[PDB]
Amino acid sequence: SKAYDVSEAVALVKKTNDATVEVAFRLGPRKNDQQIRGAVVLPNGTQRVLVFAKGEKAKEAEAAGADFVGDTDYINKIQQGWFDFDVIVATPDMMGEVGKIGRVLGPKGLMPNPKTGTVTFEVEKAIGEIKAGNIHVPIGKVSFEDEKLVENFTTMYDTILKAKPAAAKGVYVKNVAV
Amino acid sequence: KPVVAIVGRPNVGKSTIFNRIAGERISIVEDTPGVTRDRIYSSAEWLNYDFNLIDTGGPFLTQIRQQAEIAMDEADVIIFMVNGREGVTSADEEVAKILYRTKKPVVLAVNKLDNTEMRANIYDFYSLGFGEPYPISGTHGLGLGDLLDACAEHFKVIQFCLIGRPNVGKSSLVNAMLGEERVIVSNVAGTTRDAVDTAFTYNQQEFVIVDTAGMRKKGKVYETTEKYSVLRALKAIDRSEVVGVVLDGIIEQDKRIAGYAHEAGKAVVIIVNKWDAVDKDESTMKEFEQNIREHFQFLDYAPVLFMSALTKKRIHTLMPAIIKASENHSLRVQTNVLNDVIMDAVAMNPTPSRLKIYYATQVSVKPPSFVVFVNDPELMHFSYERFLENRIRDAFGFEGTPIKIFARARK
RNA sequence: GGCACAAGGGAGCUUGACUGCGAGACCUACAAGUCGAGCAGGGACGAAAGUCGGGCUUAGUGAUCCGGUGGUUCCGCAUGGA
RNA sequence: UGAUAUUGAAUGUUGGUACAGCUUGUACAGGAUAGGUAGGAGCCUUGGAAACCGGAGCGCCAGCUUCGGUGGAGGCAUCGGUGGGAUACUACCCUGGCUGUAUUGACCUUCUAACCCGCCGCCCUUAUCGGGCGGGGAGACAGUGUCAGGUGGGCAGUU
RNA sequence: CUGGAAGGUUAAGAGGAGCCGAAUUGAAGCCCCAGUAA
Ligand SMILES: Nc1nc2c(ncn2[C@@H]2O[C@H](COP(=O)(O)OP(=O)(O)NP(=O)(O)O)[C@@H](O)[C@H]2O)c(=O)[nH]1
Ligand SMILES: Nc1nc2c(ncn2[C@@H]2O[C@H](COP(=O)(O)OP(=O)(O)NP(=O)(O)O)[C@@H](O)[C@H]2O)c(=O)[nH]1
Numbered sequence: 001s002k003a004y005d006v007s008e009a010v011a012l013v014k015k016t017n018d019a020t021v022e023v024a025f026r027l028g029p030r031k032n033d034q035q036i037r038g039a040v041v042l043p044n045g046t047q048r049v050l051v052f053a054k055g056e057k058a059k060e061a062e063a064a065g066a067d068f069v070g071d072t073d074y075i076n077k078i079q080q081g082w083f084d085f086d087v088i089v090a091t092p093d094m095m096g097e098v099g100k101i102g103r104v105l106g107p108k109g110l111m112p113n114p115k116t117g118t119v120t121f122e123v124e125k126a127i128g129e130i131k132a133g134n135i136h137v138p139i140g141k142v143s144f145e146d147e148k149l150v151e152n153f154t155t156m157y158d159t160i161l162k163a164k165p166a167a168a169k170g171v172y173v174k175n176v177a178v
Numbered sequence: 179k180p181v182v183a184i185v186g187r188p189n190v191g192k193s194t195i196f197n198r199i200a201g202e203r204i205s206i207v208e209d210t211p212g213v214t215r216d217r218i219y220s221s222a223e224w225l226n227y228d229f230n231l232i233d234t235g236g237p238f239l240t241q242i243r244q245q246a247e248i249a250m251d252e253a254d255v256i257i258f259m260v261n262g263r264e265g266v267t268s269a270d271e272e273v274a275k276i277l278y279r280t281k282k283p284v285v286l287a288v289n290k291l292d293n294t295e296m297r298a299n300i301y302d303f304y305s306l307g308f309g310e311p312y313p314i315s316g317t318h319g320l321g322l323g324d325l326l327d328a329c330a331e332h333f334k335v336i337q338f339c340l341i342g343r344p345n346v347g348k349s350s351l352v353n354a355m356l357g358e359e360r361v362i363v364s365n366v367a368g369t370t371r372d373a374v375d376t377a378f379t380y381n382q383q384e385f386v387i388v389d390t391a392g393m394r395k396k397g398k399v400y401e402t403t404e405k406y407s408v409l410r411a412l413k414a415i416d417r418s419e420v421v422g423v424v425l426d427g428i429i430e431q432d433k434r435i436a437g438y439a440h441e442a443g444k445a446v447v448i449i450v451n452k453w454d455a456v457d458k459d460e461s462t463m464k465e466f467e468q469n470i471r472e473h474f475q476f477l478d479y480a481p482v483l484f485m486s487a488l489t490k491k492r493i494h495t496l497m498p499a500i501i502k503a504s505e506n507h508s509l510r511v512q513t514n515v516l517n518d519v520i521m522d523a524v525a526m527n528p529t530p531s532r533l534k535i536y537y538a539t540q541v542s543v544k545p546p547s548f549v550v551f552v553n554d555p556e557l558m559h560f561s562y563e564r565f566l567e568n569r570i571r572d573a574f575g576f577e578g579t580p581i582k583i584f585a586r587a588r589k
Numbered sequence: 590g591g592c593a594c595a596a597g598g599g600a601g602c603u604u605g606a607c608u609g610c611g612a613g614a615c616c617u618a619c620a621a622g623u624c625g626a627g628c629a630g631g632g633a634c635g636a637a638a639g640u641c642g643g644g645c646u647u648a649g650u651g652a653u654c655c656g657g658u659g660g661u662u663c664c665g666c667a668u669g670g671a
Numbered sequence: 672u673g674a675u676a677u678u679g680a681a682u683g684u685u686g687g688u689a690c691a692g693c694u695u696g697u698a699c700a701g702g703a704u705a706g707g708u709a710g711g712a713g714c715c716u717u718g719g720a721a722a723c724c725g726g727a728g729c730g731c732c733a734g735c736u737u738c739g740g741u742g743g744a745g746g747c748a749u750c751g752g753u754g755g756g757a758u759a760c761u762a763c764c765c766u767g768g769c770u771g772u773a774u775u776g777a778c779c780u781u782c783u784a785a786c787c788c789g790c791c792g793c794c795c796u797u798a799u800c801g802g803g804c805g806g807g808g809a810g811a812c813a814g815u816g817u818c819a820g821g822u823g824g825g826c827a828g829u830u
Numbered sequence: 831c832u833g834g835a836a837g838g839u840u841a842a843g844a845g846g847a848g849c850c851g852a853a854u855u856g857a858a859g860c861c862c863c864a865g866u867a868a
Contacts, residue, residue: 001691016761017712024708024763032267099301106304107755113302115265132268132707132765177763208657271707292659307755317658357844357857380842398820429821460831461868494841494858 009178010149017142021149023156026174027133034165039116041129043155044140044148049130052090052098052112057123064127075101084110089118089126135160153178180333182222183232183249184257187269188213191289191316192259196220196233198316204233205372205407212402215242215371216361217249224326227333229254241362247276255283255332258306262288262313265302274306285328288313292320337386338420338500340449341411341435344368344392346426347451350487352376352387355496361389368392372407373414380497388414395431415442419507420500422447423480427456427466428473436477443545445503445579446480449496453486479577503578510543511574520550523569533557536588546576549584558585 004012013021027036050068053061058069067085075098088105090098090112098112105111112119120126139152164172184192193204193214199222204214213235220231232253234246250256258277260270277284286308291297292315303311312324342348344367353360361374370391377386390411399405415421421439425432427450439446448470456462467482474480483499485492520538524530537551550566552558563583571581 013761019712019761020709022709022761024761026763029268032264095301096298099304100310102310103304103307103755105301106307111301111304113299115299115302134708134764136708138709175763177761268707275706295660354857378842382842395820458831460866462831464868490857492858497842 006150006153007146010153011146013149013178014142014146019142020138021140021142021144021178022136022138023153024175024177025135025137025160026177027135028170028172028174029133031133031165031167034167035133036160036163036165037135038159038163039118040155040159042139042152044144044152047087047131048085049087049089049127050085051123051127052088052094053123054091054094057091057121060124061127064124065131066127078104084108087130088112089123089130091121091123092119095119180227180229180254181232181252182229182255182257182329183234183253184259185234185246185250185273186236186259187267187273188236190236190259190261193233194316195259195287195289195314196231198319198322199231203373203410203413205410207402207406209402212371216245216374218372219375219377224330227330229329229333238362238364245362250276250280250282253282254334255285255329256280257287257329258284258308259287259289260303261290262296262299262303263290265299266305271305277306283332284308285325285332286311287325289316291315292318335384335386336420336504337388337418338422339388339390339414339418340422340424341390341415341439342392342424343429343431343435344394346392346424347487348392348424349389351424351451351485352389354487354490354493355387368394373410383501385497385500386418388418390414393435396434412438415439415444418444420445420447420503422449422496422500424449424451425470426450426452428469433474436474440477440580443547443580443582445507446477447483447499447503447578448474448480449483449485451485451487453484453491454489455486477580479571479579481578506575506577507545507579508543509546509576510540513539516540516548516570519569519573520566523566527562527565530557530562533562542582545582546579547582547584549586551588552585553588555585555587 029035048067049065051058051061051066051070053069054072061069078101082104088110092114095112095114114120118126118130137156139156140149161172184196186192188210194206196218197204197206200220203220204218205212214233215235218233222229222231232249234249235242256277258273261267286303286306288300288303288311291313297313300311300313309328312321312328314321314325340348340351345365347363349361349370350363353363356376356378360376362369368391370389372391374389375386376388377384379385391407393408393411399408415438421442421444423432423436423439423446425448436446450466463484470482481499481503483492483496485496487493517538520535524535534553535550536553538548540546540548542548548570563585567581567583570576
């Protein structure tokens with residue numbers, strides 16, 4: 001019945017366990033025009049990112065920490081197989097070509113789309129930062145200390161609010177479930 | 179022949195596309211509420227191929243959506259429009275749920291992309307798990323070639339109209355005629371929005387009935403270009419030759435509604451509805467019979483018919499009435515016989531400074547029309563013109579149709 | 590008003606049957622309105638130079654105040670955006 | 672010709688809201704055949720966990736959801752993938768209900784105080800005006816101020 | 831014009847088998863009841 005505080009819930013989701021502390025947030029479609037879906041680099045913070053870099057952009061992609069780049073087309077290797085691993089990003093030139101292949105990325109949630117900051121010319125800066133109207137966000141672990149998830153939820157809430165959606169009218173906040 | 183249908187959500191350029199395929203009958207505005215409210219048919223042409231097209235809609239929402247499901251099944255291939263600018267919405271999956279259980283072919287389309295730079299952002303549209311999206315634009319004719327082929331891949335008389343004022347029962351009238359649920363009926367005025375085609379055969383004879391959603395007072399039409407729908411009624415009148423008028427068992431606008439039809443040179447028939455509502459006993463019909471005769475005198479040839487949609491009485495007599503008006507509206511006469519009687523009229527009325535009559539002949543057969551060769555075109559009097567009119571309408575039938583009369587000079 | 594050097598026929602694909610653009614006839618009231626000089630960009634059997642079409646004018650009513658939809662290195666009323 | 676303030680008091684008839692609590696989504700899987708967000712970090716236990724037998728809702732009329740004492744420390748086994756899934760949820764939420772909680776709305780009786788009287792008495796007063804007290808009758812409608820359907824022959828404009 | 835459903839038809843069809851049309855459904859209208867004559 002009682003709404004706890006932020007300084008209490010970080011110390012208490014220690015006790016709700018090495019598990020991962022995640023946050024749900026009910027948003028306030030009618031408002032799809034100014035919907036609230038997104039990604040931001042995190043403060044208090046293993047992935048396997050595979051890139052689709054084209055041209056010279058592969059040359060800076062092999063030194064940042066990526067596992068496999070490609071031989072400029074391995075979607076034929078993606079056809080009939082392809083246990084995908086963690087994250088797929090791309091570049092704004094071959095995205096259309098990969099896209100015209102079908103929904104091998106539709107119901108699997110890895111389709112490159114430049115609304116998320118994942119399809120850009122800065123592939124070296126993109127590898128290094130990734131490593132019904134609702135958003136899910138993993139802010140961290142159980143084993144993090146009490147001062148880590150406070151900055152993590154603060155950064156994510158300031159990101160949500162920094163993004164005060166248009167048609168701001170009416171309540172924006174409905175629920176925080178830590 | 180193959181039948182194609184388009185479904186979707188409010189604001190997806192559907193009616194717009196359908197119009198761009200062929201014609202502009204479909205009403206187009208910019209707002210959430212104003213959408214095509216029911217099925218409508220047409221014809222198309224794409225190579226040897228010649229399929230049709232079914233247009234659907236996005237208060238009362240259950241009915242139209244149900245009507246859309248009716249279309250859904252009896253269709254051959256499915257066109258599923260969706261917007262491109264704002265990505266994926268809740269309503270998209272909502273409709274996708276029924277599409278998944280709809281064991282029919284699906285071709286997806288993406289609108290609102292009218293420039294090359296906007297052609298992208300299609301990868302995101304891979305959720306449906308359907309085939310390849312093909313962008314299209316409404317303002318411009320972009321990307322339609324790929325779409326049509328996408329459809330062609332799976333691809334293997336008289337007309338009369340009914341008009342009136344809103345909230346009279348005109349929609350109930352039609353559906354009952356066919357005996358089929360075809361158009362939406364509601365107790366609120368102006369439920370229907372735009373004209374709907376319906377083709378059917380009666381007694382080895384095919385017919386085409388049309389609705390016009392009723393019309394309010396001419397000063398009473400102040401809305402978000404709902405005149406844009408009113409004009410569609412006007413075009414419909416031009417399309418067909420016979421008009422039936424429906425009054426509920428009299429207001430001057432009903433006379434004004436009959437105004438456009440009479441001047442149009444189109445046969446017009448008087449019909450009443452809801453006869454069950456009023457008292458129904460001996461000699462009741464006379465009161466209305468002379469009231470309409472007294473009110474309406476600039477028309478006389480219109481026969482009077484009685485029907486009640488709810489109880490479905492006398493509805494059989496309505497159709498035949500229409501056929502009789504047809505040939506009357508398309509009938510020529512022997513010029514010898516016509517001029518044979520013109521003089522008898524002048525013999526009995528030798529008081530036309532004096533007009534002279536020499537000749538009269540039928541020229542326009544589409545609508546009973548003729549021309550008289552007199553000495554002085556100015557010397558006439560409209561009453562005398564009204565005199566020669568009745569005489570001819572009494573020599574022969576010419577009933578249920580108007581007559582236009584012309585008077586050329588001697589020359 | 591043509592005598593084939595403008596009614597046959599492989600290829601040359603093919604409505605440049607185009608995007609830029611301009612000296613004279615007109616009617617000469619002009620506006621308007623029309624018809625045909627002259628030229629960069631490859632764009633052709635093309636090789637020597639031939640290309641703005643169905644070889645008499647005969648049309649898609651007036652093509653417009655017909656914009657309400659769209660690209661904007663143009664303005665934006667105190668400074669940013671709208 | 673319909674809304675809204677005058678316009679108030681109690682009955683039942685209901686509604687609409689929100690707040691809790693309980694319950695709901697059988698699907699082409701998975702001990703059957705369930706909506707948008709993590710592959711565990713098992714439970715011993717309990718109308719049966721194997722079989723075992725009530726109860727609806729029901730049913731997708733299949734076969735489930737738990738209230739759940741026999742066998743019972745036995746049992747399925749978190750665990751995998753004939754459908755795009757796959758547990759122990761951090762769990763949020765919707766959907767469809769039920770329960771009660773409260774805040775209103777509306778109809779039925781309606782009572783009187785409102786608001787009314789071209790009703791009868793007394794006084795101002797010598798007065799068929801007017802006014803003040805009494806009774807009486809109708810009583811929350813009426814009428815009264817602002818918003819929407821005919822309708823003016825009443826007023827214009829007009830070629 | 832008035833009821834009371836009985837007598838069937840169901841009507842173009844909606845549907846269609848063989849070969850243009852099987853079966854099978856299908857409002858009215860025909861008193862199929864008189865009173866009525868406006
Ligand atoms: N910018 C832009 N606007 C478009 C395009 N196509 C349609 N629209 C706009 O979208 C509006 C909605 O289209 P409309 O056909 O009226 O939709 P509807 O009649 O409601 N039927 P539906 O909602 O199912 O599509 C149109 O009036 C037009 O202004 C397009 O390609 N680009
Ligand atoms: N009693 C009775 N009611 C009727 C009759 N015909 C129609 N109605 C009713 O009158 C209303 C009018 O419906 P509808 O057919 O939409 O009339 P409309 O509005 O004039 N047609 P539209 O919707 O195209 O404008 C409906 O409630 C219908 O049930 C009739 O003969 N008798």
